[PDB]
Design a protein around this ligand. Structure first.
Ligand code: S16
Ligand code: S16
Ligand code: PLP
Ligand code: PLP
Lengths: 280, 295
């Protein structure tokens, strides 16, 4: 049990995708190639961003950067603003999110609910931070706590749950997830593969870490997100569909080469915020 | 840990102490503590507590020979159990006919359609009654459909007796009260039957909105029953998010409404309380209602 919602965070579960695995069972035909999904929507605000959000805030506090009633500013496409708005409400901070205007109405709603101001990005936010030195910009694209959250959280859990891992597949945005989990897995798992997925450069980016990076188009991502609810029951968000596409690429390849694989892939969020788009 | 299917990634939901909201979190010197504890059943396969009964029901139906691959399932529901059964039916390869009232939220037809269940939108005029009556009439045209019947299937109650309850006693052995909504009654009947078997003085408190009585209902399991209006349930729900950061469905506000009533009681009598309450779902599929906007 937890004294706070901020604690009921991480230790997200890992689910084998039996029906979507290129080959779930070792057989006459060749060794298994398994997709395992990690459900990061099982977090305080329903996305993986709770990890860095909280770790960044607890980090600014512990530094003494943050103080009662301080204004926090963050450029975000949704998920991180939501995680920061929830944490800021519990801690007595005022959040301002700078967002692109093409973000889903669900984001806006939940942010308003949590007491966040929304400006309608990194550049704008940077300029505002400079206009108002009072305000604190945690800066998820450069903040080491972002990467540490995954190095110290997502990584170890994955490894504890899937010690036989061969690939890790995730989305590449601020890059924290792939860098932190990537750096952890690479530092512990000989010959591990770290795969990115991008839509067709942050200070957190480390060129050394990725083994592959797939570019995935919008239509493939949507397609795959639907396939995932159809086949495995998981009401994933759009990013997860692109992640799944790349994972299946990597799956086809291991299956082609006669090699075993245990592909761990991230489900960064659920479909809830994406329904207004009509992609479901 | 590691699961081989989404159906196993079910339950063992977190219990989080609500310090800001509890009438008195700390056990000090104006009195003993009055402490609220929230069980987060949104941390479940389809973001609802119904995953528990929906899976057990199917699995019980399978063991008993009542279901076979290709079988169509029929069920009346207000959303949560429909969605849960739609998920399981993708994985076990069954078809799904839901009967849902027409005045339910937008995002629950969207989601139900997404898993590819048929939805017959029964009339708003008599709510659940109308939806259950409607499913029973349907169950009668085609008896090859298997209606699990959440309102009378002890596998509903069983899922909470074997899951929700044990989990709750483990995490909160000092428990004095349990507070959940009253619909099918499985949550209160199963969690209640378990807890009363193990915790001496335990209070089992229901919440309901201000028609029939489900077959599962045993009123000897209940201590008390609160009616809650939607205006109270909304304002309570908005309070939970603002003060604990939990984004729950409107049902949880009414449970919270009940729980605070209970808590305020213990507080004024000067007695200790450890009040567990179910957050049965998250706020996702309620945003379209406008309940989270600005009063
Ligand atoms: O990077 C993604 N999503 C994403 C989408 C598609 C693909 Cl292929 C990979 C990642 N989201 C993201 C990135 C950086 C910040 C935030 C944010 O919540 O502000 C979200
Ligand atoms: O009982 C509720 N919700 C509820 C709402 C308000 C209050 Cl106060 C108590 C319960 N929901 C319910 C009941 C029975 C079946 C289903 C279902 O998902 O099919 C849902
Ligand atoms: C942040 C995010 C990503 C990418 O993770 P990074 O750590 O930013 O690279 C992918 N999907 C969703 C839904 C996100 O919120
Ligand atoms: C089912 C449900 C309830 C009531 O639980 P029962 O065990 O059916 O009495 C309350 N709230 C929500 C959101 C539900 O889905």
């Amino acid at each position: 049990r937890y004294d706070s919602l901020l604690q009921a965070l991480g230790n997200t579960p890992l689910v084998g995708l039996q029906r979507l695995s290129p080959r779930w069972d070792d057989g006459r035909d060749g060794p298994h190639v398994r997709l395992w999904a990690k459900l990061e929507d099982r977090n305080p605000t329903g996305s993986i961003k709770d990890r860095p959000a909280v770790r960044m805030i607890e980090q600014a506090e512990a530094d003494g950067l943050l103080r009662p009633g301080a204004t926090i500013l963050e450029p975000t496409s949704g998920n991180t603003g939501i995680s920061l708005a929830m944490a800021a409400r519990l801690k007595g901070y005022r959040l301002i999110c700078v967002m692109p205007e093409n973000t889903s109405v669900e984001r806006r709603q939940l942010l308003e609910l949590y007491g966040a101001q929304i400006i309608f990005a990194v550049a704008t936010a940077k300029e505002l931070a400079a206009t108002n030195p009072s305000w604190v910009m945690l800066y998820q694209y450069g903040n080491p706590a972002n990467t540490d959250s995954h190095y110290c959280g997502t990584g170890p859990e994955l490894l504890a749950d899937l010690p036989e891992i061969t690939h890790f597949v995730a989305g590449l945005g601020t890059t924290g997830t792939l860098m932190g989990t990537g750096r952890f897995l690479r530092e512990h798992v000989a010959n591990v593969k770290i795969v990115a997925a991008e839509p067709r450069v942050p200070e957190l980016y480390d060129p050394e870490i990725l083994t592959a990076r797939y570019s995935v188009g919008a239509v493939d991502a949507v397609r795959r997100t639907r396939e995932l609810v159809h086949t495995e029951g998981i009401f994933a968000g759009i990013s997860t569909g692109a992640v799944l596409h790349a994972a299946l690429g990597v799956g086809a390849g291991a299956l082609a080469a006669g090699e075993r694989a245990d592909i761990a892939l991230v489900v960064a969020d659920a479909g809830w915020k994406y329904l207004s788009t009509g992609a479901y």
